[PDB]
Amino acid sequence: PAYTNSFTRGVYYPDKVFRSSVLHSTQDLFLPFFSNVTWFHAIHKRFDNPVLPFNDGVYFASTEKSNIIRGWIFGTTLDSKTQSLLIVNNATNVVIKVCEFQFCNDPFLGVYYHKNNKSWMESEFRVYSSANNCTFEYVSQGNFKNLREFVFKNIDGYFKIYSKHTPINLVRDLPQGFSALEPLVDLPIGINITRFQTLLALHRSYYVGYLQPRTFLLKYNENGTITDAVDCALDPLSETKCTLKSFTVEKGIYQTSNFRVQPTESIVRFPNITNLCPFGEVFNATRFASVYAWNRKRISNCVADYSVLYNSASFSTFKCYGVSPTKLNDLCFTNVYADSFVIRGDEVRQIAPGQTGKIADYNYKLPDDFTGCVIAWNSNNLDSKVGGNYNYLYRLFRKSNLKPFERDISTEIYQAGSTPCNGVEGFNCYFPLQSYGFQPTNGVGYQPYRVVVLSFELLHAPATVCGPKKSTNLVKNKCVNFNFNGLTGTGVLTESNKKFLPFQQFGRDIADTTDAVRDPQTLEILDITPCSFGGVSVITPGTNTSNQVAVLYQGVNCTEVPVAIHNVFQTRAGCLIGAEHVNNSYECDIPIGAGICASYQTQTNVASQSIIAYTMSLGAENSVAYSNNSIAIPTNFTISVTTEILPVSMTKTSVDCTMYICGDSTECSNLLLQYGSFCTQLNRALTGIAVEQDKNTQEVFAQVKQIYKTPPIKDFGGFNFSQILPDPSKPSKRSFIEDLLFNKVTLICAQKFNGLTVLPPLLTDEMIAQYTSALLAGTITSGWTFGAGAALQIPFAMQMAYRFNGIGVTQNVLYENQKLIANQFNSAIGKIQDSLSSTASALGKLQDVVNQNAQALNTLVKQLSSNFGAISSVLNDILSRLDPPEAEVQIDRLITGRLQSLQTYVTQQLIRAAEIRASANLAATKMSECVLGQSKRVDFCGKGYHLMSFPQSAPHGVVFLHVTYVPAQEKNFTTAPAICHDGKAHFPREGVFVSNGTHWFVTQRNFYEPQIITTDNTFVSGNCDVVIGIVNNTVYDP
Amino acid sequence: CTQLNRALTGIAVEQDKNTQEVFAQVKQIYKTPPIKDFGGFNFSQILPDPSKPSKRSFIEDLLFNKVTLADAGKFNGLTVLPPLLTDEMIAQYTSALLAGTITSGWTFGAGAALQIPFAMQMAYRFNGIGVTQNVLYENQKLIANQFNSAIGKIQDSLSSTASALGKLQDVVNQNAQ
Amino acid sequence: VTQQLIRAAEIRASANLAATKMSECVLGQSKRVDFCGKGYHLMSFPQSAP
Amino acid sequence: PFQQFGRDIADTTDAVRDPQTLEILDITPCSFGGVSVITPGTNTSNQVAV
Amino acid sequence: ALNTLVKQLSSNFGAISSVLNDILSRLDPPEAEVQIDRLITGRLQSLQTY
Ligand SMILES: *[C@@H]1O[C@H](CO)[C@@H](O[C@@H]2O[C@H](CO)[C@@H](O[C@@H]3O[C@H](CO[C@H]4O[C@H](CO)[C@@H](O)[C@H](O)[C@@H]4O)[C@@H](O)[C@H](O[C@H]4O[C@H](CO)[C@@H](O)[C@H](O)[C@@H]4O)[C@@H]3O)[C@H](O)[C@H]2NC(C)=O)[C@H](O)[C@H]1NC(C)=O
Ligand SMILES: *[C@@H]1O[C@H](CO)[C@@H](O[C@@H]2O[C@H](CO)[C@@H](O[C@@H]3O[C@H](CO[C@H]4O[C@H](CO)[C@@H](O)[C@H](O)[C@@H]4O)[C@@H](O)[C@H](O)[C@@H]3O)[C@H](O)[C@H]2NC(C)=O)[C@H](O)[C@H]1NC(C)=O
Ligand SMILES: *[C@@H]1O[C@H](CO)[C@@H](O[C@@H]2O[C@H](CO)[C@@H](O[C@@H]3O[C@H](CO)[C@@H](O)[C@H](O)[C@@H]3O)[C@H](O)[C@H]2NC(C)=O)[C@H](O)[C@H]1NC(C)=O
Ligand SMILES: *[C@@H]1O[C@H](CO)[C@@H](O[C@@H]2O[C@H](CO)[C@@H](O[C@@H]3O[C@H](CO)[C@@H](O)[C@H](O)[C@@H]3O)[C@H](O)[C@H]2NC(C)=O)[C@H](O)[C@H]1NC(C)=O
Ligand SMILES: *[C@@H]1O[C@H](CO)[C@@H](O[C@@H]2O[C@H](CO)[C@@H](O[C@@H]3O[C@H](CO)[C@@H](O)[C@H](O)[C@@H]3O)[C@H](O)[C@H]2NC(C)=O)[C@H](O)[C@H]1NC(C)=O
Ligand SMILES: *[C@@H]1O[C@H](CO[C@@H]2O[C@@H](C)[C@@H](O)[C@@H](O)[C@@H]2O)[C@@H](O[C@@H]2O[C@H](CO)[C@@H](O)[C@H](O)[C@H]2NC(C)=O)[C@H](O)[C@H]1NC(C)=O
Ligand SMILES: *[C@@H]1O[C@H](CO)[C@@H](O[C@@H]2O[C@H](CO)[C@@H](O)[C@H](O)[C@H]2NC(C)=O)[C@H](O)[C@H]1NC(C)=O
Ligand SMILES: *[C@@H]1O[C@H](CO)[C@@H](O[C@@H]2O[C@H](CO)[C@@H](O)[C@H](O)[C@H]2NC(C)=O)[C@H](O)[C@H]1NC(C)=O
Ligand SMILES: *[C@@H]1O[C@H](CO)[C@@H](O[C@@H]2O[C@H](CO)[C@@H](O)[C@H](O)[C@H]2NC(C)=O)[C@H](O)[C@H]1NC(C)=O
Ligand SMILES: *[C@@H]1O[C@H](CO)[C@@H](O[C@@H]2O[C@H](CO)[C@@H](O)[C@H](O)[C@H]2NC(C)=O)[C@H](O)[C@H]1NC(C)=O
Ligand SMILES: *[C@@H]1O[C@H](CO)[C@@H](O)[C@H](O)[C@H]1NC(C)=O
Ligand SMILES: *[C@@H]1O[C@H](CO)[C@@H](O)[C@H](O)[C@H]1NC(C)=O
Ligand SMILES: *[C@@H]1O[C@H](CO)[C@@H](O)[C@H](O)[C@H]1NC(C)=O
């Protein structure tokens, strides 16, 4: 009876929506894969009646053997009240009928073994008893066999079926295959299902799975068909794929979620037990009051658990109104009156809001809206006293009815008619007092039900007379909230190391947050520290590498599920899991937090798949003489094409406010124009954006006052750049690398989708390419002059010879090694095409920028789906739903939320545009200062220095293929600051006197071309009498 | 909050990139040389003194003490994250860049840390503002003396004055508030 | 959040300026006169700050 | 067969299928675009353009 | 922009005067409190915008 496993199977279709080579993650009922399943037995005599609940759906699959299983009973509970889905199955077909099911023990069918010729299997047939509600009655359509598979979901009765017809080649358990399960029919029925019961045809009396609100990331095909499916949290690489929406993820930490932990919830605490609440002497008093003379005494500044008097075992009646008497202590009140007096026993009923009697008539009135509890308590063996307990009187005469809780004690000469008494009573002069008269042998009606009234007087006065709610043992060192009489917060409540004062009850920090609390029940002190918080961003590589993740926790004290099936190396960033520690700190790959980078590794020696981390150290410290002597100057150099990329513009999304909002709706436009101005200011601000980056595009591209055509005579002399010059043989006049880039960059994709009014660029593809061509032609062949007014041609053999000296290098090294320079220039171009064909890392940020453009448009459109109290993306349905007056009063706040959504969106648009203008003036800086010339200022035009950059086409962007001089050797040798000959120092303004020790020579500050000391290069200036570490040398004249 | 989570991730990327091209431009995480032979260029207040196990210096402590009132810096929604480069090794970066300009001079960024002597590195420094390095060779010991005095006056403006602390205090306090 | 993003914009512009200071002003000397502080600029010593 | 609706990369209405017949359709917003009027200065006469 | 800052007072959201004090005086002090609640929320919108 062992259990089994499932790999990936059981994926359905969301709805009839048709997609095309896209990646959606729409959330609905889902099937967790790698989830526990069961392998049953087939007849070879067990009943095989797997009857489970339909919790969130059921995953099913089977292989038929002899057309055995056909009986299903899908229902809620089957108490002869809920429906059931009868099923029939011929050879390769389906059919569903739904109505009732009433059978006991084992419902099933039976195919006999020793059948002489045939059989029919309908004798037992515990299938139907009274098919009296069959609405959705829809009828239509030797080794191992094929496979069947059914999945469903519970959406308002939509028991939608999904089926597939293909065989499998696994006879033991689930196949090692993967496929979708397309919907066949969605019956509506109308009675839900939570319990599914099945029956089958066996002589004597099939996987089962379960669904949950899981998550998925689908990947369809160009035929619009499901290919695979992945959850998110099941293996955190899947979380990475979900948050990045791709099945081929590069390695990196991707924020997953937080974790709102709350161990042992929170502790509720009130001060120590009441003080100056002697309820006994008021309620078990020898001295009570009369009904018309009811006493009135307060209880204050001491708490009352209204349940301790309940369990004090001293009453016979417990009636409380308004608020819950049970555990009423947790509620805190202004003040309470606890009064005791005596009335007739039968009158407990009469003691309530609105009840009547002689008590209410002349003795004691109760408010209709009473705010209190009422209790009566019996002492029947003590309610009478020898000599009779008639001490407490009651009133028989009163002209006026009492006001709420009014007390009448006056016993003046009572007058009833208009004939007076003159102070002496008698006939028509009625005595107003009579006594109770409690006798030991009196009947139950006069046998007292002695009542006590508890009134909670909740005026505007402060509520501090309260009840002890739940004062329990202090929770030490368990992250919990607290309830100190009204204040809460996740606290590390333990003994705290500070001094406290009588004024101290609650405390804040400089940031006004609870950092210390105080024990109200006794002299004890507590502190609070933020216990866990922290989000999760998983450090795992992508689907190309293994699926073994590593998970990091952000600044949270190791108090949540240590390493297990659910290692640990604690860091300043928090508790790290899923990655064992490594002593050595490699070169970083992916920072996670507190400067730790983790790379998956395999320690071949058995095969373990675990990720390893380390700390921040690019190699180690470099050990060279740093005090006074060692000087390092490269005898060799390289030219790496530092392909940095700058976003020159942005999609000119000149949104049309009204038409973006109010499409085919005059009511919407009418209501918007009441707000009016706003969206118009948004509109022309966006147009100002458009003109801003179009001017950027101009001055970065049409900085020349003239359109220029590249010369068709490619005599550049062995240095060529044909992959960057537009070859005159293509329909789009962009060169090779533009082709590769534009193939690499994709995804908005057109100007004709929606209210997303994509304006065409002020420079379209062919003519933005024309500008790029013009720029490259100039900066290669005429240069600054054609970029700064009148053209003057210049060969590239001089265009860069100038700019070595523009950096510090000398054009002599060009003349001496330029054939190689060109060869490695072509090598750099090859590196371009290679590392930019499919490798997106180098070409990253331009594509990235057009991304946040794309999902900016995407949040702009699906912001409509963010219905701000609406029931749709666009109110068009709601627009037609209500009367234009009612439409006015609803679209008012609804489309007001929509326009503030627009304002938000365009605000991120403004900010994005702001950093784009920053980057765009930066692009102008690059182009003008560095390509129409050269930024002599060090290392600003990409890593290393800068010689050329070649403007190559990019949607709203550009790449500047810097030709940077980069050192390659460490001649880290002894030094000489100057040449003390006879008290004077020989030195050029640039250069350093350098030697390994053989010959002290002068050489340039970035290239090791040593030279003889000469009076021309080395010219005497000042003296050398103040130096730190000089050595002498001779001087010669060539 | 989806887009704002994106925005805060953008904030993280911008800040640690700021760190990168401000600190982690180094191609080799780096530490100070053992000996200190410079020519009067006392760096105790600035360079991480190997005396303290932590690699900070006097002005680091002065900065910390002057702006201890960092308020948050945590409790309620204050989901502050520690720097992707910790304080101790961001100080290691401070040292790295320090010794880098000390030794590999301005050539540092061009690749390998091609070290050059600091004292004669100032020669390129004087030549970097149009004054010939002869003045270095003619008065540089004194140059160092009043340079050290200038650093001491900086420390004075750090401790007995808040002029050197002004807009740091403003930015941290405005973040705090 | 918008205020924080905007402040991020200005501070990050200042931060690119900081990188430029690192480059033309620490990893190099700004031939561009008198922006690295009053007077001229030779070089600078970076140091930590919160 | 199970499909009836349509979508596109930007998750907006791209194609629909006729419930009464099988036909591979497309939908595109009508014209939009814009109206930017070109004209010389009004010191020059009223020869207009759209 | 200054003229805007002035003229969204015309953008009166459901009121019919520039400065809202007369609308406040136009309704009963509780009812005026209710209406001025959302006039002032709109005014805060205008503030944060500007
Ligand atoms: C909805 O359901 C109704 C049910 O009747 C369909 O009506 C029939 O539809 C079929 C095909 O859909 C019609 O067949 C027609 O064939 C014509 C070709 O003519 C040759 O073949 C006939 C076959 O009998 C010969 O008799 C004749 O001499 C010719 O040799 C086509 O020209 C017809 O096309 C028309 O209908 C289709 C839609 O079906 C339109 O798209 C066309 O533009 C054109 O208008 C048609 O294919 C049959 O005649 C119909 N009979 C009746 C009684 O209606 C509807 O067609 C169906 N809806 C759709 C969209 O198919
Ligand atoms: C997406 O939907 C498209 C629309 O149908 C699919 O296009 C179909 O593609 C198939 C093959 O790719 C074409 O099949 C034709 O079959 C005939 C005869 O079949 C013989 O040859 C095959 C081997 O190809 C053999 O296995 C058979 O047993 C037969 O002996 C061939 O002569 C044709 O060359 C062609 O292969 C369909 O015609 C074509 N549908 C059309 C044109 O309407 C496409 O395949 C779908 N996508 C995927 C991934 O399947
Ligand atoms: C309210 O809460 C409790 C209730 O008594 C008080 O703390 C408890 O009492 C005293 C301290 O007040 C602790 O010492 C104990 O005293 C008793 C009585 O003398 C003695 O018999 C014991 O041997 C012990 O010494 C007692 O331990 C403590 N309870 C616990 C669990 O530690 C508290 O002081 C009260 N505060 C007020 C303001 O009433
Ligand atoms: C030029 O630079 C290289 C590295 O950039 C220098 O190599 C390094 O030299 C130092 C000492 O000169 C080495 O430190 C010592 O190395 C010995 C043996 O290698 C070891 O036994 C000591 O414990 C100490 O570590 C260092 O290892 C070595 N390699 C590095 C730093 O990667 C080279 O010496 C420099 N050239 C000159 C002329 O100094
Ligand atoms: C560069 O700067 C440091 C900064 O601390 C300087 O440290 C100085 O070191 C000297 C001795 O090494 C200290 O001199 C003192 O002399 C008295 C005379 O009796 C003696 O009792 C003291 O114990 C101490 O030796 C001097 O106070 C100290 N200065 C400071 C500000 O701490 C030093 O000039 C240089 N350090 C180097 C090059 O390592
Ligand atoms: C569906 O049909 C049922 C009829 O079956 C009844 O309920 C079974 C549990 C069993 O007791 C049969 O013998 C019954 O005949 C409808 O059930 C009754 O419907 C009437 C009104 O139509 C209602 O007054 C009764 O309370 C229902 N229950 C019973 C036990 O009589 C049921 O209404 C039909 N519709 C739905 C949606 O279930
Ligand atoms: C095959 O499936 C269909 C429903 O999906 C059913 O077919 C019925 O078969 C019987 C017996 O041959 C016929 O009398 C009926 O006329 C068929 N139905 C229809 C609508 O024509 C049945 O469930 C399956 N066939 C069998 C034999 O069980
Ligand atoms: C839908 O499923 C529920 C789950 O039991 C069925 O039960 C009743 O559900 C309604 C509202 O969902 C409750 O008010 C009742 O108290 C539930 N009754 C019981 C006994 O639990 C419900 O009957 C199902 N729907 C239909 C139409 O039958
Ligand atoms: C500078 O280094 C480059 C390689 O980085 C050298 O180019 C090689 O030179 C040798 C002989 O000079 C040739 O045999 C190789 O074919 C060259 N290319 C390589 C190795 O890829 C260059 O020579 C060096 N500079 C000097 C002056 O020698
Ligand atoms: C200029 O660069 C181009 C690069 O496109 C070189 O063109 C190659 O020429 C060879 C032989 O004629 C062809 O096999 C290649 O297909 C061409 N294209 C390539 C490699 O992309 C051309 O050789 C270069 N010219 C000089 C003088 O070096
Ligand atoms: C899954 O199956 C294994 C087989 O032993 C079993 O141990 C485990 O408890 C099952 N898990 C659940 C809860 O389904
Ligand atoms: C977590 O907090 C407890 C509080 O007592 C402390 O003892 C423990 O060392 C802390 N662990 C870490 C490293 O967070
Ligand atoms: C870890 O690496 C350091 C590096 O110096 C070394 O000193 C130490 O011995 C190593 N320890 C282990 C356990 O590998």
Ligand SMILES: *[C@@H]1O[C@H](CO)[C@@H](O)[C@H](O)[C@H]1NC(C)=O
């Ligand atoms: C040492 O100096 C000699 C000069 O004779 C030079 O050729 C050699 O390259 C130097 N050593 C190194 C490692 O460069």
Ligand SMILES: *[C@@H]1O[C@H](CO)[C@@H](O)[C@H](O)[C@H]1NC(C)=O
């Ligand atoms: C550099 O300093 C070391 C140690 O102080 C010394 O041995 C060496 O001679 C010095 N060299 C120069 C040129 O000052």
Ligand SMILES: *[C@@H]1O[C@H](CO)[C@@H](O)[C@H](O)[C@H]1NC(C)=O
């Ligand atoms: C309008 O003004 C422009 C401004 O220079 C001038 O060139 C043009 O000739 C004027 N035309 C008329 C008709 O006034």
